Amino acid sequence: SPRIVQSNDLTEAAYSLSRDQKRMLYLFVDQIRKSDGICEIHVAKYAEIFGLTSAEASKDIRQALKSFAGKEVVFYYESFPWFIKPAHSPSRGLYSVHINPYLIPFFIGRFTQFRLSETKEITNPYAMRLYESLCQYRKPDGSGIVSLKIDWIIERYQLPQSYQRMPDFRRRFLQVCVNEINSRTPMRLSYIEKKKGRQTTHIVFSFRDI
DNA sequence: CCCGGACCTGTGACAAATTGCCCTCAGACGG
DNA sequence: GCCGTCTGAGGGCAATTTGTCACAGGTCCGG
Ligand SMILES: [Mg+2]
Ligand SMILES: [Mg+2]
Ligand SMILES: [Mg+2]
Numbered sequence: 001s002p003r004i005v006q007s008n009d010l011t012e013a014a015y016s017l018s019r020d021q022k023r024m025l026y027l028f029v030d031q032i033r034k035s036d037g038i039c040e041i042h043v044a045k046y047a048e049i050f051g052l053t054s055a056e057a058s059k060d061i062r063q064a065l066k067s068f069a070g071k072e073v074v075f076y077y078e079s080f081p082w083f084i085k086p087a088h089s090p091s092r093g094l095y096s097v098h099i100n101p102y103l104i105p106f107f108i109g110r111f112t113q114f115r116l117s118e119t120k121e122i123t124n125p126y127a128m129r130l131y132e133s134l135c136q137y138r139k140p141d142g143s144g145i146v147s148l149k150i151d152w153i154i155e156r157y158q159l160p161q162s163y164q165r166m167p168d169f170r171r172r173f174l175q176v177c178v179n180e181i182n183s184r185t186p187m188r189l190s191y192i193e194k195k196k197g198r199q200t201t202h203i204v205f206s207f208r209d210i
Numbered sequence: 211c212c213c214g215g216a217c218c219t220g221t222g223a224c225a226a227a228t229t230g231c232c233c234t235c236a237g238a239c240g241g
Numbered sequence: 242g243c244c245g246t247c248t249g250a251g252g253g254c255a256a257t258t259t260g261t262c263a264c265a266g267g268t269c270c271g272g
Contacts, residue, residue: 019228043249056230058249092237093249123229124258162261167220172259198218198268219267227259234252241245 002030002116007109011136014074016158019125020064023050026116028099029107037099044093050120061095075106112136121184127177129157131185134207142209147194147202166200174203186210 004026017025024041031039047057065087073080085098114135122128137144154163163169174191181189187207194202 047249052230054247054249055232055251059251062250160260165262166218168261171220172261176258213272214270216270217268219265221263221265223261223263225259225261227257229255229257231256232252232254234250236250237248239247 002026003113004029004116005033005111005113006132007106008112008136009075009106009109011112011132012076012156013106014076014156014158016071017125018064018067019123019128020060021067022125022128023120024061024064028097032099032104032107037101037104039097039099041095041097042093043095049116058093065095065097073103118185118187122180123184124177124180126157126159126173127180130177131181131187134187134189134205138207143207145204145206147204149202150200153203 006029023046027041027046028039041061043054043057043061046052046061047054050057052060068083069086071082073082080102081100082103083098084100087095087097089095112132112135114132119128119131122131133148134144134146137146150166150169153159159169159173163173178189178191181187186209188210189205189207191203191205193200194204
């Protein structure tokens with residue numbers, strides 16, 4: 001199945017994308033890498049890849065596509081837009097998109113890689129952002145360990161403002177995404193909290209391969 | 211002493227958003 | 242050349258998930 005690879009600069013970039021948008025982003029990165037920035041997505045291919053009907057596939061592409069407008073990417077800083085021209089459909093079931101050519105060197109560079117089947121059942125986009133970052137530290141055999149800072153998680157992933165209250169951080173982001181990964185990917189994940197005084201400052205993730 | 215106050219935790223409520231589903235009907239193709 | 246079938250571009254839904262905040266209940270500090 002398709003092997004996604006990406007610069008660590010992208011894994012650790014600041015952005016806010018939906019699941020549907022991240023799914024499309026994986027194929028653009030695949031298309032570009034197998035080579036101006038103009039990519040294409042076929043409705044019938046997307047539906048087969050992610051096990052959707054053609055109808056719901058069409059709905060997912062169209063709304064994702066119109067929600068890219070105004071979205072920006074930050075590399076730690078420097079900010080760029082994803083698209084420099086609106087999308088358009090020359091043929092029925094076919095969309096043409098114009099990716100910002102200045103993003104190309106950030107896609108292909110110190111790199112991250114995973115097969116698309118590892119993530120295609122994840123639902124929560126924050127859970128995607130997390131499985132990508134853990135992969136950045138994975139070993140050939142399949143294990144790894146990493147300490148991520150809470151302020152850095154909140155910015156890079158662009159968690160919503162109320163998750164600056166730690167019990168909400170735990171309840172609606174950390175626990176759910178650890179469960180999805182354990183339930184929807186071939187990885188088995190655990191964690192522990194690092195504290196300093198009364199404040200919890202980092203999260204230490206351990207994982208192995210099933 | 212014990213207070214009011216500034217931290218921290220977890221849970222119950224509700225609002226806002228997203229999920230996979232359902233229905234309609236016209237376009238492109240081929241037999 | 243007409244029509245039958247597969248597509249996909251639209252319109253919606255109720256059931257769940259995600260985002261937000263009041264309130265109960267722990268600690269330590271300092272005047
Ligand atoms: Mg959808
Ligand atoms: Mg009680
Ligand atoms: Mg009290």
